[PDB]
């Protein structure tokens, strides 16, 4: 029964994502290669299954450092970075693969399914 | 031109209130008169003037507990983080004034302008 306030959601994600472009209270880095990455695990942690089973985890809770798997495509990653903060998914034809891999390593299964339909449509 | 996830913003926000409800990654204690409230910075940055003025600053940025002022109502202060949590907002007859001079304290101008909605709908 209480007041819904519509917008306060995407609202607080915006100013997550300031506060990301700023670094101020980033706690990791995402290294993907030859490119490093800085974000919140929190929001990591809450896009993420991969990331939610590492920093759920208390004998990993506080590493700082989490090298991924050398495979991933960086610029995959970082789509879906963009994503997790922005709630808009850059998909395009030249980069659909690397993505879904990349969604099914950071076990986003609906983004994952999200790819299939972009798939699907050609 | 990037695909919109409609519920996503949604999702964090309700995936950080369950890290709350868990103790996961909180990195401050608010003290209110004889109660205390653990919460995510990055969260109360992004939801009040207040915290967000606190934490910008080099000087307080890691502050681990904020003592907030003596005349703050706890329970008006739980129903504002609870809101920012949850874009729900509990504003009832016997608790407006409580909420909204809280709201003043913090910051927080949108909850503010509702709150005069309120009032004036009696
Ligand atoms: O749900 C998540 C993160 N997330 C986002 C999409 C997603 C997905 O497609 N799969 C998974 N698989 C892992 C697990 C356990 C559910 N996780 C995913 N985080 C979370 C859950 C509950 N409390 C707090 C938080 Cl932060
Ligand atoms: O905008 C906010 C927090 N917030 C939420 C409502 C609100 C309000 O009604 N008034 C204020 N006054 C203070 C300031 C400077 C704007 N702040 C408010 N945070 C933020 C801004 C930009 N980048 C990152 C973040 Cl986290």
Known sequence: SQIQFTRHASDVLLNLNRLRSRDILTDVVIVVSREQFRA????LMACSGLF????????????????????????????????????????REG????????????????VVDTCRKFIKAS
């Open 40 to 43: 919140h695990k929190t929001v």
């Open 52 to 91: 939610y089973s590492i920093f759920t985890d208390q004998l990993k809770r506080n590493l700082s450092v989490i090298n991924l798997d050398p495979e991933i495509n960086p610029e995959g990653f970082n789509i879906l970075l963009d994503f997790m903060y922005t709630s808009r998914l850059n998909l």
């Open 95 to 110: 980069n659909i693969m690397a993505v879904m891999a990349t969604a099914m390593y950071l076990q986003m299964e609906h």
